[PDB]
From a paper:
The [name] complex is a regulatory hub involved in gene regulation, chromatin modification, DNA damage repair and signaling. Human [name] is a 20-subunit, 1.4-MDa complex with five functional modules: a scaffolding core that includes TBP-associated factors (TAFs); a [name] (Transformation/Transcription domain Associated Protein) containing a phosphoinositide-3-kinase (PI3K)-related pseudoprotein kinase (ΨPIKK); a histone acetyltransferase (HAT); a deubiquitinase (DUB) and a metazoan-specific splicing (SPL) module. [name] regulates gene expression by interacting with enhancer-bound activators, recruiting the transcriptional machinery and modifying promoter-proximal chromatin and is known to be involved also in DNA damage repair and signaling.
The resolution of our structure allowed us to visualize InsP6 in the positively charged pocket below the [name] FAT domain. On the other hand, an earlier structure of the yeast Tra1 subunit17 is better defined in this region and contains an unattributed density where InsP6 is seen bound in hSAGA, potentially linking the stability of the [name] FAT domain to the presence of InsP6. Comparison of our structure with that of ySAGA reveals a crucial rearrangement of the [name] NTD within the core. A number of mutations, including the prevalent melanoma mutation S722F ([name] isoform here, S721F), are part of a highly conserved surface patch and probably involved in effector binding.
Numbering used by the authors:
A (entry chain J): 104 to 233, 248 to 331
B (entry chain B): 1 to 203, 255 to 585
C (entry chain E): 10 to 133
D (entry chain G): 59 to 161
E (entry chain N): 507 to 559
F (entry chain F): 5 to 134
G (entry chain C): 1 to 26, 31 to 372, 390 to 428
H (entry chain H): 114 to 181, 188 to 218
Write the structure that this text describes.
């Protein structure tokens, strides 16, 4: 009975058998791409066209309508902004309009919801019927008072861990599997934090600077 | 269009070996012996391979053509090493002499006449007091063209050999902190090619003890016992870990301000509760903090803490001072299957659904090495007794031995008919056992990398293995709710009740449902765990 | 007998993978899974055909719809080739230098779960 | 005009700033994004035997996969809602099952 | 009264390649970064083959 | 060397497509059938993988939904009852359907049904010699 | 525990020391690695010349001159020239490639680590040459990045060994199996297992953690300079980074600095002013209080006494001192409207009596007793006179005249 | 008339969802289920989620038969649930009859 036990198991289809075949063209100087990893900038409209045409060729086409270039540029910028928003949301407060539209990304207003004063201020200062400077100054002071953050603190610049957590949580900002899967692994291999010895040298250097200042 | 034959594989292997020039220009049937070595000769091999190249050339060297800099870099370094008033500034002082000699000698081979003289004038007056080094410092004074360096006798050994220096780890980090602070590329080139820093660390049959869990209800997943046999831990499908004290003592936590298995609102006060002596201990504790089913819990070598992995692709370290998760390792994007710790608690690795395993240190929260190469889920992992090699089982019916420090596959066994589920090394570091759904138990010979022994008799999935502290017996647990101990040592027998005859020693299938674990201890002890019903 | 043919098909699949026993309604779950997958594929094919300005759908539209679906939903980890490249790029970094320890060393506090919220007040 | 990541960041939040590794990673992700989107659009063009990569291909792909709608390119291609009607046999079996349930 | 069956394991009509492309024989890539270098090297080997004749 | 793999009939795929409102040709039906079979087998393997690491033989609906969730696929709702759902044949004897009885809500809404908690876990030691 | 670790570390230190000093000694063709091991064995026997130096430090670079070896050469031209690859031919010939820019540093990463790229091998096999030596390929790196001597060599020939990696082995497995035959998964795994077994490093199977301590020490020392901050620092100054920096000089300024724009645009307009009375550019100095020590020349003739005058005084007898006010000094002022109006013209009288330098005043109304008050001095008297005149005029609200008189 | 602070109000809101259910769900994520405030808030969020779907379903049921009275039994069918659920990206497609 045992021998015919593992003959009908699952055989996943190798993903490379359907890999695209690569054909070599003439090596010219004019035929260049400027992938953004090489030039640390977003590609301009002209630069994008060179690679768009090159890719189109391997699929048996002639040229690009030149309205496609604009759409692709706009989409790339939009997508990058979406990812940036996802990362930002995890370390700053914000407001909501109509239930989803997030605008004010500072950490200021955020009325603490457990204060009787906050409960009263929420009903009025939020629902405004849809501003002399003295009145606005008073109300700004009130909003800062209700926030509760007596001694606010700040964060270091955005590093790898923030990106990793943001990507893991939301995950609807990269619907396509190919883009997400390949880049998440790359992100993992760039996680880093200074170890004990480096912190010791930071200690020593701080002592040195304090001394030379006195 | 037909399946290749067994010999054709050897034929292609030989063709590859010949093309890449690995064997002589004939049948190397003589060759094929160097499949092992001792400690000293391994050290010799690694030392020969260490000096058989340069670790960094292209990026370690400066590219701008601005000879003025060689002065500035050395001047800044001297100023920094002078005003320093540390004990490191001492230990990192000797480097200046080789630095100066080599920088000057490299200037000579490419530098217009203006620069070298200014260089010699600006710093030469600090290598005089010692006698052994005044000789060459003066000799350099009369040197312009390359023929100077080749002709002279003392310059040569410098040019064609490296200078040695000895440092502590703290001192070397002292130099690295400075080197990275600003552009010091020229010095980095000199250190890379010519100087050779050396860093070293600063200064009478057996008896079975059985355990049973009653009220689990299809939730218990795994369990383990610590080496000093004082604790018992288990994981559950509903995310949680429970701990029991085997001894007569109770478990009580100590003060701790922070706990992640708790939620506070903005209107709360952090206060250490004083109504606590009322408790004064208990026999059981619930560890909380994973958000998915748990799949492995392992103890440290000295029973100090606990480590666990879960479906939520996280690994957590539990402190037994307070029974609370205090560290969190995040290095996976898919559920983690297995976990394992090195013999003296130096490393720990983890298999995962993402087709790979990863190496970790207990003092960094990010992986250190990645062992890719399996074709599917890496279900099992085990360290070698010396903690230098790594075995991993996979659903692709294959097992790979890895080189821990370097991280490449050194062996690849085949022969299993179904996925693999367990592994075990003998404490003499000679064999490796493995079992899986096939219901066959294979011991491999690591040196030769070939099948050594095959045992049969179990009728369902084998899910655990272990050796005795003297490679005497190997115990196995199966899904048939049975525990069978085995003996491989020459002592022969005639008891062929099934396929395996002379190895099968004892069988234990008492009133017991699914089994969990099997261990061994100092003297003929074999701890078991599992659930029962009667 | 009592069952329809599809239930037998699903039971046979479960047997093939090596499942001895299981909860009954699993088969109903699998039937709904297949039905939903097929219906969604057809609905996508309709759109892709109407994009090409042609009559009732054919093979090419369906294959395109399936490709678009698989580029999103039915996923699995990347292959061995990509993992080998990232592994090569990772292993080059150095490992810590061993030394005698009075037990394993934990990482620095700033990167451990031992920090209380700064808003909260503490009491003596 | 020249474009940098910080230029996009300012649109979202002026006061934030990234590390260097994050800057490298975001550009790598953008490269992958373009490489996928353009290929998908090219295949959609290949579907209808067309000779040129028209914008409506990109519009369709962006709408269907990434749920993205770029607004300034007209409305020449909006499918008009249909009735989505059912066939004879289907209603037939549904009526049959209703009957079998009634008694 | 037999469930229809085939003699080979089923295959998906269309699946998800990870954007990979095969450079030569037995090598695959995912980023288009070696395109320039591969063109250069191919020409070099072409010429180095031409001259030996 | 000879092996078999049950696959759904063309008729089932055509019957499904009917509800959509499309009449399908011959080749397309077989194409879809093979694709669906491949997806079913993939999902079943993934589900079994989770069960492998728990030491229990029965496969639940939670395992299936978990495997679906990790593979980035919406989950199936309405089958987590742990009680059998018998099927019903119609009059002719070829069509089947599941029993779906109307239920009066207010009765369940107005009713007290105290549940029994669970019991705590405990471990007994059990030595033996051999 | 700590004791066991110390024992293992001592064992590892001893093994390292002995292997460094006392190497053990282990065919038609002798392997390149065999020759490396032998050249290492020799270098141990010798003694060095200089104290604090070693001999066995470059086993490859020395084993190059000792015979001809076919290598792969890399040319790293300076500035923004790029890099290129050369391949020496069988006929004293050569071939070279296009110059690739310094931004596409995909290959340099492989060179930076001594790892054989997989693209290279697929072609190097097609080029029928025997440049392989036990998997590894030796390469020579010439760089004209830094030189201003205008010589023939002008480069530093470095040699390195490009070891094969797990990528190469998988590519090889892919390549061998692409033959006309069929291959089943089991067969591919068998082939891979054989290949791994053949070309794998020997295993030091021994149960003692001294082995891992030795391995960790040796590897750490091999690669102790690849920390993340090191690589960031290298990358921060590499050539591509500089090329990016140059572009930044043309971006505009932020807000709050528009004042620079205003000033720049304003300056150009013009400069001019009529009747410019300034005669100093350095008039905007700070320590204006400083004065240079000035030596004046003696004037020829000083004529002060022509204008000096003495005032009369009452000369002194031998009992009393001099008393200078020589006579009473009286001054009177009168004010009147002069109209027919009744204005009661009034009078003011300053006085300085004999032998008394104080001043006094009185404001009695002039006719048609002794109410004097102290007035300080002459300047005060003038002040009082002015103030009284102003008050009288402001009170009159009509014409008023002043009639001054003396003594 | 009164405007007591939030925590005073919360003690009066009774959730339909029992506390033990919320405890079950909190234990999965690794939290000790003893704080009454957290249990209340989670239960209230779940209740709101279900209530919105119920409201939309009843409105859709009302609109269904308009062209071609008050006293009628309101029953819930899948054709009422499907559009209501689709507001939340839940695509309901269920078979009708098998073979």
């Amino acid at each position: 009975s045992v021998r015919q036990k593992f003959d009908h198991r699952f055989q996943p289809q190798n993903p490379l058998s359907g890999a695209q075949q690569f054909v070599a063209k003439d090596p010219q100087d004019d035929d260049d791409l400027k992938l953004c990893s090489h030039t640390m900038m977003l590609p301009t409209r002209g630069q994008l066209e060179g690679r768009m045409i090159v890719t189109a060729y391997e699929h048996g086409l002639d040229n690009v309508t030149e309205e496609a270039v604009s759409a692709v540029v706009y989409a790339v910028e939009n997508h990058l902004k979406d990812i940036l928003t996802s990362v930002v949301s995890r370390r700053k407060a914000y407001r909501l309009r109509d239930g989803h539209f997030k605008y004010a990304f500072g950490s200021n207003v955020t009325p603490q919801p457990y204060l009787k004063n906050s409960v009263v201020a929420y009903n009025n200062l939020i629902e405004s019927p849809p501003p002399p400077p003295d009145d606005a100054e008073q109300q700004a002071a009130l909003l800062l008072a209700c926030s509760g953050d007596t001694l606010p603190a700040s964060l270091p610049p955005v590093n790898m861990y923030d990106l990793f957590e943001a990507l893991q949580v939301h995950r609807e900002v990269i619907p396509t599997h190919t883009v997400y899967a390949l880049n998440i692994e790359r992100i993992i291999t760039k996680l880093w934090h200074p170890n004990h010895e480096e912190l010791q040298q930071d200690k020593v250097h701080r002592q040195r600077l304090a001394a030379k200042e006195g | 269009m037909k399946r290749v034959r067994t010999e054709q594989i050897q034929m292609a292997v030989s063709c590859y070996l010949k093309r890449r020039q690995y064997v002589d220009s004939d049948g190397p049937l003589k060759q094929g012996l160097r499949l092992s070595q001792t400690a000293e000769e391994m050290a010799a091999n690694l030392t020969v391979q260490s000096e058989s190249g340069c670790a960094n050339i292209v990026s370690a060297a400066p590219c701008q053509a601005e000879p003025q800099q060689y002065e500035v870099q050395f001047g800044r370094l001297r100023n920094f090493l002078t005003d320093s008033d540390s004990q490191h500034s001492h230990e990192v002082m000797p480097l200046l002499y080789p630095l100066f000699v080599y920088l000057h000698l490299n200037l000579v081979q490419n530098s217009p006449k203006s620069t070298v003289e200014s260089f010699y004038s600006r710093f030469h007056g600090m290598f005089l007091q010692n006698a052994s080094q005044k000789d060459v410092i003066e000799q350099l004074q009369t040197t312009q063209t390359i023929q100077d360096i080749l002709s002279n006798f003392k310059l040569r050994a410098f040019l064609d050999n490296k200078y040695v220096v000895r440092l502590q780890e703290d001192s070397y980090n002292y130099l690295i902190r400075y080197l990275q602070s600003d552009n010091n590329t020229a010095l980095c080139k000199v250190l890379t090619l010519h100087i050779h820093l050396d860093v070293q660390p600063a200064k009478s049959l057996t008896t079975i003890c059985f355990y049973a869990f009653y009220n689990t209800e299809q939730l218990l997943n795994t369990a383990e016992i610590s080496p000093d046999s004082k604790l018992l831990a288990a994981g559950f499908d509903n995310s949680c870990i429970k701990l029991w004290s085997l001894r007569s003592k109770k478990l009580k936590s100590e003060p701790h301000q922070v706990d992640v298995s708790r939620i506070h609102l903005a209107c709360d006060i952090l206060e250490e509760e004083d109504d606590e002596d009322d408790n004064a201990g208990t026999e059981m504790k619930i560890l909380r903090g994973h958000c998915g089913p748990v799949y492995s819990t392992r103890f440290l070598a000295d029973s100090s803490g606990l480590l666990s992995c879960s479906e939520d692709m996280s690994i957590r370290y539990w402190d037994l001072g307070s029974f609370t998760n205090t560290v969190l390792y995040q290095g996976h994007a898919y559920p983690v299957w297995d976990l394992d710790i090195s013999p003296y608690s130096l490393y720990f690795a983890s298999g995962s659904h993402d087709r790979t395993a990863r190496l970790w240190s207990f003092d960094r929260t990010y992986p250190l090495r990645i062992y890719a190469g399996h074709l599917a889920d890496v279900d099992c992992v085990k360290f070698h007794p010396n903690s230098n090699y790594l075995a991993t089982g996979s659903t692709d019916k294959t097992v790979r031995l890895w080189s821990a420090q370097q991280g490449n596959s050194v062996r690849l066994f085949t022969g299993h008919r179904g996925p693999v589920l367990s592994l075990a090394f003998s404490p003499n570091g000679k064999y490796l056992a493995s079992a899986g759904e096939d219901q066959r138990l294979k011991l491999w010979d690591l040196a030769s990398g070939t099948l050594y022994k095959e045992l049969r008799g179990h009728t369902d999935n084998i899910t655990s293995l272990t050796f005795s502290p003297d490679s005497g017996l190997i115990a196995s647990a199966s899904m048939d709710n049975s525990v069978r101990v085995w003996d491989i040592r020459n002592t022969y027998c005639s008891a062929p009740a099934d396929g395996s005859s002379s190895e099968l020693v004892g069988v234990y299938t008492g009133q017991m449902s699914n089994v969990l674990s099997v261990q061994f201890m100092a003297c003929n002890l074999l701890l078991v765990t599992g659930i029962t019903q009667e | 007998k009592n069952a329809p043919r599809d239930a037998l098909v699903m039971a046979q699949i479960l047997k093939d993978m090596g499942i001895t026993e299981y909860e009954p309604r699993v088969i109903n779950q699998m039937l709904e899974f297949a039905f939903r997958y097929v219906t969604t594929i057809l609905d996508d094919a309709k759109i892709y055909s109407s994009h090409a300005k042609k009559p009732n759908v054919d093979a090419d539209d369906v294959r395109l719809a399936i490709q678009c679906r698989a580029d999103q939903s039915f996923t699995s980890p990347p292959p061995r080739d990509f993992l080998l490249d990232i592994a090569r790029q990772k292993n080059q970094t150095p490992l810590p230098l061993i030394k005698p320890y009075a037990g394993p060393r934990l990482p620095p506090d700033r990167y451990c779960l031992t920090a209380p919220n700064y808003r909260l007040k503490s009491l003596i | 005009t020249k474009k940098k990541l910080q230029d996009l960041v300012r649109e979202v939040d002026p006061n934030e700033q990234l590390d260097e590794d994050v800057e490298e990673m975001l550009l790598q992700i953008a490269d992958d994004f373009i490489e996928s989107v353009v290929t998908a659009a090219c295949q959609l063009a290949r579907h209808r035997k067309s000779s040129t990569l028209e914008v409506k291909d990109v519009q369709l792909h962006l709408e269907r996969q990434w749920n993205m709608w770029i607004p300034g390119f007209g409305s020449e291609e909006i499918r008009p809602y249909k009735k989505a009607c059912t066939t004879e046999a289907h209603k037939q079996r549904m009526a049959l099952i209703r009957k079998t349930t009634k008694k | 009264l037999d469930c229809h069956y085939s003699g080979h394991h089923p295959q998906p009509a269309s699946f998800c390649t990870f954007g990979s492309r095969q450079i030569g024989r037995g090598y695959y890539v995912f980023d288009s970064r070696w395109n320039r270098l591969r063109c250069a090297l191919n020409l070099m080997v072409e010429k180095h083959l031409n001259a030996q004749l | 060397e000879e092996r078999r793999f049950v696959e759904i009939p063309r008729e089932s795929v055509r019957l499904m497509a009917e509800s959509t409102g499309l009449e399908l040709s011959d080749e397309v039906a077989a194409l879809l059938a093979e694709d669906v079979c491949y997806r079913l087998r993939e999902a079943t393997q993934n589900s079994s993988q989770f069960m492998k690491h728990t030491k229990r033989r029965k496969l639940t609906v939670e395992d299936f939904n978990r495997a679906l969730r990790w593979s980035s696929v919406e989950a199936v709702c309405g089958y987590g009852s742990q009680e059998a759902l018998p099927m019903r044949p119609a009059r002719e004897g070829e069509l089947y359907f599941p029993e779906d009885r109307e239920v009066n809500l207010v009765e369940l809404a107005l009713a007290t049904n105290i549940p029994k908690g669970c019991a705590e876990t405990a471990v007994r030691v059990h030595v033996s010699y051999l | 525990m700590q004791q066991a670790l110390e024992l293992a570390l001592d064992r590892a230190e001893y093994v390292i020391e002995s292997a460094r000093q006392r190497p053990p000694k282990r065919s038609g063709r002798k392997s390149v690695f065999q020759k490396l091991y032998d050249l290492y064995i020799e270098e141990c026997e010798k003694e060095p010349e200089v104290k604090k130096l070693r001999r066995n430090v470059n086993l490859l670079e020395k084993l190059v001159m000792q015979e001809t070896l076919s290598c792969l050469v890399v040319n790293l031209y300076p500035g923004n020239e790029g890099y290129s690859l050369m391949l020496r031919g069988k006929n004293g010939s050569d071939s070279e490639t296009i110059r690739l820019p310094y931004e596409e540093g995909e290959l340099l990463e492989y060179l930076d680590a001594e790892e054989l790229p997989p693209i290279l091998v697929d072609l190097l096999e097609k080029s029928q040459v025997n440049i392989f030596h036990c998997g590894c390929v030796i390469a020579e790196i010439r760089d004209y990045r830094q030189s201003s001597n205008m010589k023939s060599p002008g480069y530093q020939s470095r040699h390195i060994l490009l070891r094969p990696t797990m990528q190469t082995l998988i590519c090889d497995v892919h390549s061998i199996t692409s033959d006309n035959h069929k291959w089943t998964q089991e067969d591919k795994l068998l082939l891979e297992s054989q290949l791994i077994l053949a070309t794998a490093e020997p295993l030091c199977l021994d149960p003692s953690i001294a082995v891992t301590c030795t391995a960790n020490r040796l590897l750490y020392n091999k690669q102790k300079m690849n920390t993340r901050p090191m690589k960031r620092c290298f990358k921060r100054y590499s050539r591509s980074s500089l090329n990016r920096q140059q572009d930044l000089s043309h971006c505009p300024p932020p807000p709050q600095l528009r004042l620079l724009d205003f000033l720049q645009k304003r300056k150009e307009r013009k400069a001019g002013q009529h009747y410019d009375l300034k005669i100093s550019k350095a008039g905007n100095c700070v320590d204006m209080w400083k004065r240079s020590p000035c030596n004046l020349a003696i004037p020829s003739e000083v004529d002060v006494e022509k204008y000096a005058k003495v005032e009369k005084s009452i000369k002194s007898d031998d009992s009393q001192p001099t008393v200078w006010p020589a006579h009473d000094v009286k001054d009177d002022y009168v004010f009147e409207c002069e109209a027919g109006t009744q204005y009661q013209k009034t009078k003011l009288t300053i006085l300085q009596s004999l032998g008394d330098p104080l001043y006094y005043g009185k404001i009695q109304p002039c006719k048609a007793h002794s109410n004097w008050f102290i007035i300080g001095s002459k300047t005060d008297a003038e002040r009082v006179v002015n103030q009284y005149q102003e008050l009288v005029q402001n009170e009159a609200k009509c014409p008023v005249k002043m009639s001054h008189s003396s003594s | 008339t009164p405007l007591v602070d939030f925590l005073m109000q919360l003690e009066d809101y009774t959730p339909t969802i029992p506390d033990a259910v919320t405890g079950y769900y909190l234990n999965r994520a690794g939290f000790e289920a003893s704080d009454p405030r957290i249990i209340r808030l989670i239960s209230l969020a779940a209740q709101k989620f279900i209530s919105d779907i119920a409201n939309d379903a009843l409105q859709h049921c009302k609109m269904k038969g308009t062209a071609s009275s008050k006293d009628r039994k309101y029953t819930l069918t899948m054709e009422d649930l499907t559009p209501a659920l689709s507001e939340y990206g839940i695509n309901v497609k269920k078979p009708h009859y098998f073979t």
